[model samples]
Target: RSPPSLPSLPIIGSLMSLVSDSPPHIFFQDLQKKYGDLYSLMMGSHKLLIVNNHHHAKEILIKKGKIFAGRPRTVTTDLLTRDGKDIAFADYSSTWKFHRKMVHGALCMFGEGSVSIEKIICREASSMCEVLTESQNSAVDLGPELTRAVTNVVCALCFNSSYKRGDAEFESMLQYSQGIVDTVAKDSLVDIFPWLQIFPNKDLRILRQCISIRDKLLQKKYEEHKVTYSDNVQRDLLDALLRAKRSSENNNSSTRDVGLTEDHVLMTVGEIFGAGVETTTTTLKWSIAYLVHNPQVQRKIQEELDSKIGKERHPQLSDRGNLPYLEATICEVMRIRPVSPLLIPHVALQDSSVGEYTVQKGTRVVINMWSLHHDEKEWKNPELFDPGRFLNEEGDGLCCPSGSYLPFGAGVRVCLGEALAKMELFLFLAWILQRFTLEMPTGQPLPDLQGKFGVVLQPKKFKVVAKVRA
Candidate 1:
């Protein structure tokens, strides 16, 4: 039997329906009911195969990782990403391997002694506590609060200078990085239609402005680190990268060898801040939202924090082992609102089959993570806010490791920042619980967990009120 082709109309495909700004999860659900689990939809001239089923998702992501790991080039990747020199969304190529390898080496090396990473996490979490402790009277924009704090952790890791809250350079990096995330999420027509690049337009105008500012900042930061490069271990990500660049140079100094190059090193540093910071911050935002919605669950977390972990000092990464239930609660939140719901769409470098279809070399395949995360078969009560699922075998609770649950994504392209992101979420969640009891804004319902799709998972303009926990 032949499968049906995706429905299409002139100019608009499924995009017109998508434009309603409805939460993508709900929209996808509606489409699933209407068009079955694995229907294709037209988006302009492109055919997007939407998979809302877990078996199909797992089949593509795990069973056939190599053929399904390529990225789809878009307007955003071409412009802001130095044409995919950075790893996360880069197309499958030599440049990507170089970028991925450098990050893997640095993170894997630094991933040990994570004491340095933990100190940064504790410092940032403590900073959040200090803010909420003082600002109990007014509403705060946690969106930026989480953004700035986590950005510093990566900045501290990448550069020894963990800027004090509002440091000018730190502020610039945050705004620029945020701009890049927002623009990438736009999923703009111009992003798909490269032919549009020839025109002079306002969006392009602003894009150019952002690009120049972002690239200049990235270059300046990289050069600064090169001058001060150290292998002192505690000097952070920049030192690791600078050291790697030197080693690559010594391995083969030829201009053609690319064992070392200024552009690659510089762009890689930019991506550390660009990809790592925003994603962890957004997931923290979702965690807080889930906690506020389920206060009894929230109270249970606080109970565990106080009774087991205590508030004598700020929470530490090692303390996470002792605080089982809090860890489970954070895990559940990530499971529900995965920050990058649709990981970069992969294009097979060779022939492949992503379920029933014979996916050819060059076909664009998206993971449709939104579907798998919420799949009823995998999650017990897929829609509910429950943390009990992750409770460890010893009858204590903890985060599930790899494969079984992958909010960080899976396979060769799994998030390099996973360790760092996980530490940030756990430390920050515990710190907030140890200090404040979140209350929903008086009139509104819980900021709906519904998310908007972009370069990363995002929910918009939600607010909450917090009262200090005594």
Candidate 2:
């Protein structure tokens, strides 16, 4: 049988219901209860297949990865990516394949799961701790410091440089990154009414301006890398991308037919930062927020750090295996508050079948990750925020539940920064626990844990004191 389609109003289809101002994941979950796991929602002329359960999601994301790995081109995505020049939003083409290979190779060579990456993260973690330890008051917003810390890792990996917290270039990158993520998914009025884009739209205007600033910064970095480009030397991700481009240009027939260009490299690195930094920072913030609300769990983590890793040295990625409880907590945080709730919306490049239904080509689909994360049948007391769910029988280590959980997505489009993000989360969180104990501000209640949904589901900004651990 064909998948269920939501009830609709003429022309607008399911637009009114979809734009219900609810966190889209939850909104889709509610519909899932009524329509079953696989259902379609119409927005203007587009049909969106919402895969709310693991069975269907895995089928589309894994089994049909080649066909469904394509990305839907939207007004905001097109504007931000300069019409899919970036790996994240680009269609599944040879360009995408080459781009992904280059990025994966570069990240692997530089940082992801590497000793050097761990060192880079620890260095930034120390910088973050120094800033936090100087907090004059009982409370400080760790947002800015955390943002800068993670962004520096990206800067270092990509451009062979790191930025100070207040550097103008760093500030500009952060602002535009925020602008793009905050506005793109939040303002979908133009998306649902394509003609609405023709008029003077505040959100559209701001989005264009933000992308322009973002592209310029990326272009500057690309040009700088070009001047110092040497075939003999490999410095950072930029150099790696450049070398790959040259290799493709010289040797590959595919490249001769349609090649990787300057904009492609610039946008590729930019996508890494744009996607990597904000989500990572937001996830760290979520971890902090969760810890503030769950101090008992926080104490357990600190105890684990104290026993396995002492204050004399910084935490290392190698120590992650020994820090099971801490790893479990991070896993739980990801499960409860996934950074990208909808996993950036996949597009069907050709006709595909997910479970019992057919998804036609050009259909936009979202893996309703929130529902899977909180699936009542798959998870015991799914609504409860418990880290023990991921712990092994001995309770001494971590063991993830298979199939049902996919915080970084799955298959071909799984987050390119998973290893980097994981390393940063473990190192940074361990460093914080080693140096300080977090507390909600003296007279303040825990910030509302509900997220404000955008491209990522972000916790509302909250202040907490990192009281130095005695």
- lDDT of residue 394 for candidate 1: 68
Q: Positional deviation of 262 in candidate 1, in angstroms?
A: 2.0
Each model's Cα RMSD = 3.5, 2.3
lDDT, candidate 2, at 126: 89
Cα deviation of 195 in candidate 1 (Å)?
Answer: 0.9
Compared with the true structure, all predictions reach lDDT values of: 0.70, 0.82
TM of each candidate vs. truth:
0.87, 0.94
Model 2 agreement with the true structure over 96-125: per-residue lDDT tens digits: 887777777777788434347677888888
In model 2, residue pairs whose N, Cα or C atoms come closer than 3 Å (at least 3 residues apart or on different chains), thus clashing, are: none
- What TM-score would candidate 2 get against the native? 0.94
Expressed as tens digits, the lDDT of each residue in 1-470 for candidate 1 is 22244556776665655665555555665676677777666667665666667677777677777677777777667676666666766665666666676666666555335456677777777787778767787777565676777877787766655677657776776666656666664667786566777876556667767789987877777777667655655366666666666777667543334434676666777778776777887888888788877888878888888887775666777786788787788778888887767667767778766567666566666656767777765667788888887786764756463344777666677778877777888888888878788887667787866665676777766777778873
Error of 1 at 322 (Å): 3.1
